[PDB]
Design a protein around this ligand. Sequence first.
Ligand code: CLA
Ligand code: CLA
Ligand code: CLA
Ligand SMILES: CC1=C(C#C/C(C)=C/C=C/C(C)=C/C=C/C=C(C)/C=C/C=C(C)/C=C/[C@@]23O[C@]2(C)C[C@@H](O)CC3(C)C)C(C)(C)C[C@H](O)C1
Ligand SMILES: CC1=C(C/C=C(\C)CCC[C@H](C)CCC[C@H](C)CCCC(C)C)C(=O)c2ccccc2C1=O
Ligand code: SF4
Ligand code: SF4
Ligand code: SF4
Lengths: 86, 194, 70, 645, 185
Amino acid sequence: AHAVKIYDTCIGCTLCVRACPTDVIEMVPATVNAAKQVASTPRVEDCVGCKRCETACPTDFLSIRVYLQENEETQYSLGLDLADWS
Amino acid sequence: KETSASVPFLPKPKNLAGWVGGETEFDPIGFSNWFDMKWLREAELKHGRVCMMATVGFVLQPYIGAYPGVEMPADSLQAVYAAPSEAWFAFIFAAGYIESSSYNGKITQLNMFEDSDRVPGNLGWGSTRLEGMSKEESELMQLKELKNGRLAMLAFSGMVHHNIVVKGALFPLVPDGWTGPEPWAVGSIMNNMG
Amino acid sequence: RKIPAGPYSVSVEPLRDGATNEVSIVTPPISSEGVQEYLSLAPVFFMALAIFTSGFAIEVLRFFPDTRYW
Amino acid sequence: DFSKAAFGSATGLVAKAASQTTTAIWNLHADAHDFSNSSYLSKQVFAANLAHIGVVFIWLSGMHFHGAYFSNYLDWLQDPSIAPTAQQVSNIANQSVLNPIRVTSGFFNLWLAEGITSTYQLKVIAAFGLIASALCFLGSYFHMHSSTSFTRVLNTKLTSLSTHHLVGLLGLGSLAWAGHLIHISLPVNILLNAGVAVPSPHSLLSSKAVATIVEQLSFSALTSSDGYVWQPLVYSAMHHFALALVLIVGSIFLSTASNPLMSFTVGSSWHLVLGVQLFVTGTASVLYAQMSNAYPVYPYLLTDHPTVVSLFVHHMWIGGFFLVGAFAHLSIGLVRDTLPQSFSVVLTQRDIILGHLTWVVAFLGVHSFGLYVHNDTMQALGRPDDMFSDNAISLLPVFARWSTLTLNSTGSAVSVLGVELSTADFMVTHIHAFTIHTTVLILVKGFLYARSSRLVNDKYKLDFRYPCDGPGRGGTCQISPWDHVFLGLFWMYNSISVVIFHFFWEYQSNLASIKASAGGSIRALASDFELNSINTNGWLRNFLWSGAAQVIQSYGSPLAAYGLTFLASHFVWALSLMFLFSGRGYWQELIESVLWAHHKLYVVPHIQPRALSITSGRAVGLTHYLLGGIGTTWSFFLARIVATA
Amino acid sequence: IDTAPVTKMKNLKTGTVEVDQTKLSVKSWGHMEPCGQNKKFQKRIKDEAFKLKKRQDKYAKGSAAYAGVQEVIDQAKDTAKAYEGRWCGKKDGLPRVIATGEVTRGGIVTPALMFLYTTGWIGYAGRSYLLRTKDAAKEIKIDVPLALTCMTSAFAWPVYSWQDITNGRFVAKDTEIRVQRMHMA
Ligand code: CLA
Ligand code: CLA
Ligand code: CLA
Ligand SMILES: CC1=C(C#C/C(C)=C/C=C/C(C)=C/C=C/C=C(C)/C=C/C=C(C)/C=C/[C@@]23O[C@]2(C)C[C@@H](O)CC3(C)C)C(C)(C)C[C@H](O)C1
Ligand SMILES: CC1=C(C/C=C(\C)CCC[C@H](C)CCC[C@H](C)CCCC(C)C)C(=O)c2ccccc2C1=O
Ligand code: SF4
Ligand code: SF4
Ligand code: SF4
C-alpha cells in the first residue's frame, strides 16, 4: 500500500480529491488554511500510486505526497484486473 | 503631411530636428527611429574623419615616399604588405590609445553617450575655434566637416575599388587599351548556369 | 459573421442581396510594424543570424581556402 | 493585422507566465499542425493540403531545374549506360571529390518515358512547376482566408468528392496520360531508339505524322520497329486507357451511397479519413516498390541498378511510414471522438483480437528466428545436414511454386514470374510476415486500448498523446496510443530494414549470378543470398560486413559523402539511444545546476530552461533512431550499389 | 615468435631529473621537421596532385568541369606551398598543431586568443541583452535594434567583464540566487 501523506501546506483546493481515480483523498475540516478544509487519505489501501493527486496540487511543492512502496504491493495498488488475491 | 526635404516621396524622419546636417533630413530606411542619434552622429563623424585622412594618405602615399627602407607601392593597396611590422604595431597602439582615452573607457554603443554632456563627435581637438564664432557660423563649419566627410568616404571607397578593377595605381586612370574592366573571376549562381 | 468563416478572413459576408459592385481586396491586411515584428522573432532572427554566420564562413573559406596562414 | 496574427502563437506564449518556458516552445512546435476542432477546421485542413501540394510542386520544379542545368541528361540520352548525375557540387572547403553526384531518383528514365529530349523542355517544366506552386499557394491562401467552410465534404458532400475523384481526377488523368503516351511519348521513343532524330513534340499532333503516315495498328512500322525499350510504354498506354474506361464506367455503375462517418465528429472524421488514406497510400507505395523491379516500365531502368535499388528502398520506407501513420490517425480519431460507437464490435473483442494477434506474433517470431538460430547453431557445431537449407531439411515454399490456371488467352503472369524459390526465401518471407505482424500488433493494440484498458480505465480522458498515467499500478508508462505508434515505428523500422536487406541481397545475388559469363550455366546454389542468408552469421558476414567495404573504403572517392553520411547516421542513432534510454528528471536536475551557474553570472534567461518532456524526449529519440538507421542503410546501399554497379 | 617492440627506459638512479632547456622548442625536436623537406609530405603532395590530374583528365579540355578541377589543382598547389612552413612529423608527413604555447607555424596561442575573444564577445552580447531585456517577451521577440546594439557593443568584453568582476556587478551573491539548499543546509 503506497503511503500517501498530507502536509500543512495544503490549502483546501479539493483538486487532489477530484484527481484520484480510486477515492483515496478526502476533505476534512481543519483550522490551518483559509479554506478551513484539508485533504486526508483515509483509504490509502485503494491508492494505485498514479500520482494524479500530485499533478493537481497547486502549492510550491506537493502538499500531498505519494510514497511508492514496491515491497508492499497489493492487488489494489497493482491495479490487478484478472487476478484476485482476496 | 510632413515629408522629408531630401526625399519628397518619404515621410520626414524624426530625431533629425536639431542637428548639423538634419535640415536635409535624409533617412529613408530610418535608423534614426531605431538607434540613438548621438551614436549615429559620432559614427558618421568618425567615418568621415577616418576617410578624409585615408583619402589624403591614399593620394599622397605614392608621393611622400615611405619609412627609410620600405617601398611605398604606387598602388596604395599593397602598402599594407610593404609596411613594417613595427610600423603596424605603432599604428595600432596609437589608434588604440587615441580612441580609448577619448571616451575615458566608455567606448561602446551602450555606454558612450550615457554620462551626460558627451557632444557627438567632440573629442576636444580644437573645439575652442567653435567656442567662439556665432552659432550659425559654427554650425556651418560643422556642416562643412560633415559634407567633406561623406564625400571622402565615398571617394575612398571609389579609390579602393578603382585600384581593384584596374589592378594598378589610382592616378593612371583607364590605362591604354582599356576596353572595359576584366570580367569578374570566381564562381557564382549565374556562373554555373543558374 | 453568421456564416462560419475562419479567423483573419478577407472574405465578405456571403449573405448579400443582388449582385454588388463592391471592392473586396483579397490580399492579406498585413502591417509594416507587424512584418518587422514578425521578422524580429527569435526563430526568424536567430536563423537569419545563423545563415549570415554560415555564409560569412563560406565566403572566408572560398577566398581563403584552407588554413594557409596558420 | 494578419502579420500581427502570424506571430500570434508567440504572442500568446509570452502573454502568460505559465507559457514562458522552453517546454512552451516545444509544445508550439508539436501542436503546429494539430488543427483544433473549430468551425474552420475543414478550411484549415484543405488549405494545408493545397500548401503541401505547392511545396511538392516547388520540389518538382527544382528537380527539373537540376535536370536542365546541373545534369548530364543529354549525355545520358546519347548513352544510357553512363552514370546519371543531376547535382553539381561547388568547390568549397574540400568537397570537390564528389562534384558529380550520381542521382538515383530515376528522373532521367522518367523524363525519357515522357518524351523529353531537350534541356529546354526541362527548363519549361521547371518554370511551369514554379507557376503551379504559386497557383497552389494562392489557392491555399484563398481557401484558408476566403472560401467555403468545407465542413460538408466528408459527411454531406462525400458522394460528390468521391465521384469527382473517381471520374475527373483519376480517370481523366489516366486518360490524359494515355493520350500523352500515345502521342508524344511513344513516337519520341521510337525516333530515339531508331536514331532518326526527334522533331518538336507538337509536330506529332499534326494528323500528317505517323498518326496517318501508316494506319496499321500493330507492331509494324518504318524499317523495323522491334525496340523492346518501347513496348513497356505501349503497355502503359493501353493500361491507362483501360483504367480510365473502367473507372469512368464503374463510377456511374457504383452505389457510393454509404458514408460511414455520420456517427463521427468533424475532427474525428478528418482523422479517420487521413488514417484510411495513409493506409491506402502506404500499401500503394509498397506495391509500387515491388512492381518497379517486378515489371519494367521505364526506359533503361533495370540497367541502372542504383536507381532500381533506390526506388525500391525509398518506396518501401514510405509505405511502412504511411502504414504506421494510418493506425496512428485511426487511434487519434477513435480517442478524440465523443461517441465512437462504430467500433463497438472491436472495442468489445479488445482482448480476444489482441491476444490472438499476440499468439500469432509469438508463434511467428519463435518459429522464424528459431529457424535462423538453429541454422546458426548447426553450422557452428559443424552439422550442415541438420540445418534448414536445400542440401538439408528443406523448407520449400510450395505455395509459392504454383500459379497454373486455364489460359483463356493469357500469358506471362500465369506462373511464379519465372523465379524459383528456396529455403532462404521461405525463412526470410516468414521473418517479414512476423515483423509485419508485430508492427500491426503494436498499432492495433494502441487503437484498441485507446479509450480504456484493464490497467487504466479512463484513457479516453487522457486524449491521444500523454506520457503516462503515473508510476502506479506497478507503472503505467507508455500506455498512450501515441506511445504505441512510437513503438510501432521502431518495429516498422525493423520490418522494413529486414525487407530491404532481403531485397538488396537477392538483387546483388541475381546480379552476380547473371554475371556467370554465358557458358557458366550451373549456378548450383551459388546465389550468395540463397547459400548464406540462412544464418544470422551468414547475414552478418556475407551481407553487412561484406558490402560495407564499399562504404568504408570510399574516402578519397566520390562516395566519400556516402561514407561520411554513414558515420553521421551512426552518430545520430547513438544519440537516439541517449534520448530513448534516459529520462526527463535527470536532465531537469542537470539543467537546474546549469541554470544556477547562469544565475551566478547575472545571465538569468526568462524563458525558463526546461528539458524535453517525456513524450518530447521519446519523439526526439525515435526521430534520431529512424534517421540514423535509415541513413546508415541509405549510405550503405548507395555506396555498395554505385561502386559495384 | 616475438613480442611487441620493447622500449628502453632510463635507469635514472642519479637522483636528478634533467630537463634540457634547448629542447623546449619545436625546431629542436627530433621527431618533427618542417614540411618543406619532409619526404613523406612531399610524396603526399605528389600523390594528391596526381589524383587531381587523373580526375581532371576525365573531362575534355576547355569544359566547365575541366576548369573546376583546374581551380582545385591550383588551390592544392597554393595550399601545399603554404603548408611547406608547417611542422609534420618524420614518418607521417601530416602537418601538426603545436599546443605547447610557443608562437610557431601551426601553433595554438593565436587561434586560442582569436576564438576566446570572439566567444567572449558572443557571451557578453547575450548577457548584456538579457540584462537590458529582463523580460521573456523580449527574449522570444528579439528587440533587433537593442540586440544589435549589444552585439556590436560587446567588442569591449575582455575589459568590461573584468571591471564588472572586480567591482561586483558581474557575479551574484550566493545568498541572492536560487541555490540548491533542499537538504536544509
Ligand atoms: C498524410 C500524412 C500525414 C499528415 C497530414 C499528418 C498530420 C498530422 N499528424 Mg501525423 N503521421 C503520419 C502522417 C501524417 N500526419 C505518419 C506517416 C506517421 C507515422 C510516422 C505519423 C505519426 C504521427 C504522430 C505520432 C502524431 C501525429 C500528429 C499529427 C497531427 C499534428 C502534426 C504536427 O503538429 O506535426 C508538426 C510537424 C512536425 C513535428 C515536423 C517535425 C519534423 C519531424 C518530427 C521529423 C522530420 C525529420 C526529417 C525528415 C529529416 C531532416 C533532414 C535531415 C537530412 C536532417 C496532424 C493532424 C500528432 C497529433 O497529435 O495528431 C493529432 C502526433 O502526436 N502524426
Ligand atoms: C522455433 C524454431 C525452431 C524449430 C522449428 C527447430 C526445429 C528443429 N530443431 Mg532446433 N533450435 C532452435 C529453434 C528451432 N529448431 C533454436 C533457437 C536453437 C538454439 C537453442 C535450436 C537448437 C537445436 C539443437 C541443438 C538441435 C535442434 C534440432 C532440431 C530438429 C529436431 C528438434 C526436435 O526434437 O523437435 C522436437 C519437437 C517437438 C517436441 C514437437 C513440437 C512441435 C509440435 C508439432 C507443435 C504442435 C502444435 C499443435 C499443432 C497445436 C494444435 C493442436 C490441436 C489441433 C489439438 C528440428 C528440425 C536437433 C537436430 O539436429 O535436428 C536436425 C538438435 O540436435 N535444434
Ligand atoms: C546569453 C547567452 C549565454 C551565456 C552568456 C552563457 C554562458 C554560460 N553557459 Mg550557456 N547556454 C546558452 C546561452 C548562454 N550561455 C544556451 C542558449 C544554451 C542552450 C543550448 C546553453 C546551455 C549551456 C549548458 C548545457 C552549459 C552552459 C554553460 C555555460 C557557462 C560556461 C560557458 C559555456 O560552456 O558555454 C558553452 C555554451 C553552450 C554549450 C551553448 C551555447 C549556445 C549559444 C551559442 C549561446 C546563445 C548565445 C545568445 C543566443 C546570444 C544572443 C545575443 C542577442 C540576443 C543579442 C557560462 C556561464 C556550462 C556551465 O554551466 O558551466 C559552468 C554548461 O554546462 N550553457
Ligand atoms: C580638425 C582639426 C584640425 C584638422 C584637420 C584636418 C586634418 C582636416 C583635414 C581635412 C581633410 C583631409 C579633408 C579631406 C577631404 C578629402 C576628400 C573630400 C576626397 C575627395 C575625393 C574625391 C571627391 C574623389 C576622388 C576620385 O578618387 C575617386 C573617387 C575616383 C578616382 O578615379 C578619381 C578621383 C581621384 C577624382 C587641425 C586644424 C589640424 C587642428 C584642429 O585643432 C583640429
Ligand atoms: C539529452 C536529453 C534531454 C535534454 C535535451 C534538451 C535540453 C534539448 C535541447 C538540446 C539543444 C536544443 C540542442 C540544439 C541542437 C544541437 C546544438 C545540435 C544540432 C546542431 C549541430 C549539428 C551543429 C531531455 O530533455 C530528455 C527528456 C526525456 C528523455 C531523454 C532526454 C535526453 O536524453
Ligand atoms: S490539491 Fe494540494 S493544496 Fe489543494 S486540497 Fe489537495 S492537497 Fe491540499
Ligand atoms: S496516487 Fe492516484 S490513487 Fe493514489 S492517492 Fe494519488 S490520485 Fe489517488
Ligand atoms: S517512468 Fe516516466 S513514463 Fe513511466 S510512469 Fe514514471 S513518469 Fe510515467
